[PDB]
Amino acid sequence: NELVQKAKLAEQAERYDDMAACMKSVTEQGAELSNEERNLLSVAYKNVVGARRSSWRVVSSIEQKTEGAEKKQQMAREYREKIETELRDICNDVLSLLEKFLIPNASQAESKVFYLKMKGDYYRYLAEVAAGDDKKGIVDQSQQAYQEAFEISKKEMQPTHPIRLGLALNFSVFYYEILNSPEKACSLAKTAFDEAIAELSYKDSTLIMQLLRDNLTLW
């Protein structure tokens, strides 16, 4: 388990590129990531996209406020696509490993749910990055990606299991933001928040239910 240990280490240093890069390898083996290597690949790519998505949210904002300058807006736009290209390049690198290696090897309900949800998000990030017709195709790719997860876990996992909420949290975040349809968003979370409360891991569960609660009062 050298790659995992190296990734555990690249996390401690906060060098996230090496996190994913040595995590890609164990996925490339055709093996089924364990409950730990799942999380290590999860944080590995989350921090790599959080950075670019965080840079994009800044450069995009500047590009809006630069109505004055003419050539300055050119560079601001030029850099933005440079981040999106960096953002897209990492996303394609994760989805590809997903479809090729993880989901095909998946056997457990949590395994399939985790990887399709991972597929779902890595299409929601692409959606925001996407500008036009790409948005339609990629979001359409996004909706299918999550939906397979949601119908898997409606019955093939306990009502309180964290991914069931994790699938509920982000699937909904795709619902409101990308589809611009709060109605489906609040419906998904409310159903999801309700079924857990009736069924009310506990400390883990309540960590994200607060985000489930805040979403409901958000949209």
Binding site: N39, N170, E177, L207, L211, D214, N215
Partner: protein, 171 residues
């Protein structure tokens, strides 16, 4: 938004209880003795320590006091131990003899016969908190076996402690 993760009288305690007079407060719900302790206790004011927020006489005599939310002395280092010695020292200076409690507000401000009688019990409270510089132990032993302004100076000497350096800021 946000996605999944990675990796009036209110509540009662005692008499004492919570309150709501102009905000959440504590209500200090025999009568002759209760009034006497009210008179001595009500003296404290005009400081960052021993602050109140109201009073009551009927239909149930009580005192409304400011609330506190933090790791109280028992509920829970030197950053407050200075405050406790100072607050008791200052109150002793104003000639209030307690001869007898410490609660944290914002988790940073710890809020609280002769003066030495309060000194004897404070040494015990300090000892339990510490169980580190040797000066802390020596001061506690001396109190149990001086003048509070001397104890405050004793903490000042205990303030010697202040890892890794720090270069010009990254800006």
């Amino acid at each position: 938004s946000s996605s999944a993760p990675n990796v009036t009288v209110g509540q009662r305690i005692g008499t004492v209880y919570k309150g709501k007079w102009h905000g959440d407060v504590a209500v200090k719900m025999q009568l002759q003795a209760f009034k006497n302790e009210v008179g001595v206790l009500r003296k404290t004011r005009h400081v960052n320590i021993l602050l109140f927020m109201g009073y009551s006489t009927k239909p149930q005599l009580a005192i409304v006091t400011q609330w506190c939310e933090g790791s109280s002395l028992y509920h829970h280092l030197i950053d407050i131990a200075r405050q406790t010695a100072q607050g008791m020292d200052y109150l002793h200076a104003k000639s209030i003899i307690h001869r007898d409690n410490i609660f944290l507000h914002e988790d940073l401000t710890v809020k609280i016969y002769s003066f030495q009688s309060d000194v004897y019990a404070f040494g015990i409270v300090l000892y339990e908190l510490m169980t580190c510089p040797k000066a802390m132990k020596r001061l506690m032993a001396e109190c149990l076996k001086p003048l509070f302004p001397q104890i405050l100076a004793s903490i000042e000497l205990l303030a010697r402690s202040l890892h890794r350096s720090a270069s010009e800021p990254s800006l």
